[PDB]
Amino acid sequence: QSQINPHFLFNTLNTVAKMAYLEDAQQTSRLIEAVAAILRYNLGDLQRTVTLADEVRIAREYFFIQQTRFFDRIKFSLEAEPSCLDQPIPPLTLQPLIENAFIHGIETYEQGAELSVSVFAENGRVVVEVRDNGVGMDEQVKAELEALIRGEEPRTRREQTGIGLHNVIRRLQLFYGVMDVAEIESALGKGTTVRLWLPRWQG
Amino acid sequence: QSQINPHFLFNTLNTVAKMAYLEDAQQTSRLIEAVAAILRYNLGDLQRTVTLADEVRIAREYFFIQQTRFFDRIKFSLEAEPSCLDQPIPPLTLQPLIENAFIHGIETYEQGAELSVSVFAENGRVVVEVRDNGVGMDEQVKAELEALIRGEEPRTRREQTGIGLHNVIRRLQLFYGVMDVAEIESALGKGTTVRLWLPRWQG
């Protein structure tokens, strides 16, 4: 099941945000504003169309929140070519990749994790690279993702966080009408790069 | 899917709670503490055993949050016999009933909604009554719940908030080993009472 009520949670965070304003808690207000922005975006219609600029805005809010809590354990980097940010894309494409890389890092390092996001053009495609310096993703997990990218449906398993990497790939494939929307680069001790290859759609 | 990450949300609320303390935002801190308590409880193991006292504690946090936002639209009432609160019960039994009654009320009234919770003993059973003064629940919905209470599985429908009333009933039936764990009292214009009838289990 889903053991919580997200709409109650959003309304409650707005009540907290109102009280923080009333008490002039300026730094608290900024944090609530960031998590409110993420929650609002994730409660939107999953089948709407956004642009990469919206995905990157949400990524900045996420980095702002995590930097507040983890400032000396992990380093965040975000770079983007502006001409790429008008790319139409399904919402909640980038966040699952970033959360994957963040868990990888916090799970590999006491101090020293790195998470980098890069968005750039390459020969007719928009590349979105999410890189971490973790221990490397599991080989069976990687194989199953690569099979999905090629079009083969992976093994169904019981108890099939939130949107995972498989759902992101599937939504990109249906959105753009092409299967080869991603590649994974990983090796023991040398981290993980998930690289999206999105057909450049000026509009 | 579930379009949000609850563990990220809980960790973030703890970061907000830390900042509220650092800025001496006392009323903000109290609200965060309440929603943190609810979120922590709802992320627990659904198959653990709690007591009615735990369910009532969470209900008070919920009323505290909703009273802050809705103080002149709805009146909350909570009464309980203390000897009943050691009753073992599945977690997240009471909250779905209360959220049902709250939506009923906020949807029927601009001002004047009432939501009452009562817990008392009656001939070998612990009664949990959740009452609202709304317009009455839909007759087909009520019929399907009563069928489930009798043991007949209702019609399966696609896109089958959070835990609903059907899941609460099913979990109570499996927990106590009896089917007749609830009754619904509702009529157009005269509100809704959901009444749980729990076998008194001293231990």
CATH number, domain at B125? 3.30.565.10
Provide Rg for chain A, Cα atoms.
18
DSSP-derived 3-state class of residue B86: coil
Q: Does A49 touch chain B (CB under 8 A)?
A: no
DSSP-derived 3-state class of residue A151: coil
Q: Are residues A53 and A39 in the same domain?
A: no
Q: Does B84 touch chain A (CB under 8 A)?
A: no
| Contact criterion met (CB < 8 Å) for A35 and B23 | no
Q: Are residues A118 and A157 in the same domain?
A: yes
Q: A-chain residues within 8 Å CB-CB of B163?
A: 1-3
Q: Are residues A7 and A101 in the same domain?
A: no
DSSP-derived 3-state class of residue B113: strand
Question: What is the tally of helices (H) and strands (E) in chain A?
Answer: 6, 7
Number of domains in chain B: 1
The CA distance from B17 to B25, in Å, is 9
Contact yes or no for A68/A31 (Cβ under 8 A): yes
Q: Are residues A7 and A78 in the same domain?
A: no
Q: Does A160 touch chain B (CB under 8 A)?
A: no
B157 part of a folded domain:
yes
Q: Are residues A110 and A82 in the same domain?
A: yes
The CA distance from B4 to A37, in Å, is 12
Q: Are residues A78 and A176 in the same domain?
A: yes
Pairing between strand B74-80 and B113-122? parallel
Dihedral, CA atoms, B5, B9, B10, B14, nearest 10 degrees?
A: 150
Chain B residue with minimum CA distance to A16: B28
B122 part of a folded domain:
yes
Q: Are residues A107 and A70 in the same domain?
A: yes
Q: Are residues A114 and A165 in the same domain?
A: yes
Looking at the complex, report in whole angstroms how far the Cα of residue B47 sits from the nearest Cα belonging to chain A.
12
The CA distance from A47 to A106, in Å, is 31
Cα A24 to Cα A29, B23, B27, B116: the distances in Å are 8, 9, 11, 35
Burial B6-39 (b: 16+ CB within 10 A, else e): bebbbebbebbbbbbeebebeebbebbebbbbbb
Resolution of the experimentally solved model in angstroms: 1.7
Nearest to B42 among A4, A20, A65 (CB): A4
The CA distance from A5 to B162, in Å, is 5
Q: Are residues A14 and A107 in the same domain?
A: no
Chain A residue with minimum CA distance to B36: A9
Q: Are residues A30 and A57 in the same domain?
A: no
B20 part of a folded domain:
no
Which residue(s) pair with A129 in the sheet? A118, A195
Q: Does B15 touch chain A (CB under 8 A)?
A: yes
Q: Are residues A163 and A125 in the same domain?
A: yes
Q: B-chain residues within 8 Å CB-CB of A163?
A: 1-3
Q: Are residues A39 and A93 in the same domain?
A: no
Nearest to A161 among B6, B26, B32 (CB): B6
DSSP B177: T
Which technique was used to obtain these atomic coordinates? X-ray
Domain that holds residue B89: 44-199
Q: Does A48 touch chain B (CB under 8 A)?
A: no
